[PDB]
């Protein structure tokens, strides 16, 4: 289903989205029940809010800062009191339209918050 980044709420089962990267941090190790994974972290927004993004896999590492991207098949969990977007194996990412797409001063600041 199609989202604006403000409406996420949590267990969204598939969602798509169009974003710009805010910030992209370095990859690293996180442990799991099922083992070991492979994470990094990103900040991406669109007109109507921001939200934090882990991408799992081979997604991990693989988008930069300025980028604007549309994400297909992502979920979404909660943690910590906030929504949070996730990318993984069955997820794509391409790059987007930049046609005018706002860039971070005209993003705003509020995040998805959990019940």
């Given at each position: ?26 990859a690293r190790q996180i442990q799991t029940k099922n083992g070991v994974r492979t994470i ?14 882990t991408?799992w896999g081979?997604?991990a ?18 943690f ?36």
């Amino acid at each position: 289903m199609e989202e604006k980044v403000g409406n996420l709420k949590p267990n969204m089962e598939s969602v798509n989205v169009t974003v710009r990267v805010l910030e992209a941090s370095e990859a690293r190790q996180i442990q799991t029940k099922n083992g070991v994974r492979t994470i990094s972290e990103a900040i991406v927004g669109d007109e109507t809010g921001r939200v934090k993004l882990t991408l799992w896999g081979k997604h991990a590492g693989s988008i930069k800062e300025g980028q604007v991207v549309k994400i297909e098949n992502a979920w979404t969990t909660a943690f910590k009191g906030q929504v949070q977007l996730n990318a993984g194996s069955k997820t794509k990412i391409a790059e987007a339209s930049e046609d005018g797409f706002p860039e971070s001063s005209q993003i705003p600041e509020n995040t998805p918050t959990a019940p």
